[PDB]
Design a protein around this ligand. Structure first.
Ligand SMILES: O=C(O)c1ccccc1O
Ligand SMILES: O=C(O)c1ccccc1O
Lengths: 135, 137
């Protein structure tokens, strides 16, 4: 049928507008979108599985694991001691990574503002309320 | 408070998608379709011969999985790649009559599933919301 736009398709197109602008906004900080996903979500949920991080970042779990290894090698994500056990604590942000995540969150906030700029301010607030009500 | 604190737009969009996908899949199940197969059907119904990569991106799946979906729909008589009648090439993937009828039923149930996800906004909020989605995309 020629006149079919399902909700999932509309969401995907908003995403297709959004992801390149978020990437371009993150580029001056040396970050990709999956790295920002990893940083912020790890700042909210320590040790969150690579599978869910990959699901959120629209990447394969292998690619998200490479993201994790790079952020760990760069000193942004640490798995600390856990002096009681033989295994480490859930993956967590360092001071390096938390300052990094704060700047990335500023830049991503601005990028979302530029994507939302095709609506009026009340339309933007109402649209965000609808998104929160749907999710 | 919680995970939604200072939630970026991509995270909120992902949350709506996370509500929507199980309901769409459950709605598609009685027709023998998965979500990736339906995405493939609809997109092929409007754009013949679309690369497996783009179909996979739209279905949020790997290109390998989308190639399996393609074999699946072709084996089921919904998607044909017929031989070129006088060259030797293979024609772009398009829907057959059976694939078009299949897509008509699938789009009916998917529309209903979207209605159930949208039921958490009022009807005017539904119209507003979909127009806003259209302007954002
Ligand atoms: O039609 C789509 O492209 C789609 C995508 C994701 C979820 C549900 C959908 O109908
Ligand atoms: O923060 C996210 O989870 C996100 C996901 C996709 C695109 C942009 C984003 O900020």
């Amino acid at each position: 049928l020629a006149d079919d736009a399902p909700l999932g398709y509309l969401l995907y197109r908003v995403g297709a507008v959004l992801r390149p602008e978020v990437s371009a906004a993150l580029s001056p900080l040396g970050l990709t979108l999956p790295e920002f996903v990893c940083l912020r979500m790890l700042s909210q949920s320590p040790g969150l599985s690579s599978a869910e991080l990959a699901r959120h970042a629209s990447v394969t779990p292998q690619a998200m694991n490479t993201v994790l290894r790079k952020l760990e090698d760069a000193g942004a994500v640490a798995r600390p001691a856990s002096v009681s056990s033989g295994r480490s604590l859930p993956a967590t942000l360092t001071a390096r990574g938390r300052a990094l995540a704060k700047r990335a969150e500023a830049v991503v906030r601005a990028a979302d503002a530029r994507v939302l700029a095709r609506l009026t301010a009340p339309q933007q607030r109402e649209f965000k309320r609808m998104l929160e009500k749907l999710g």
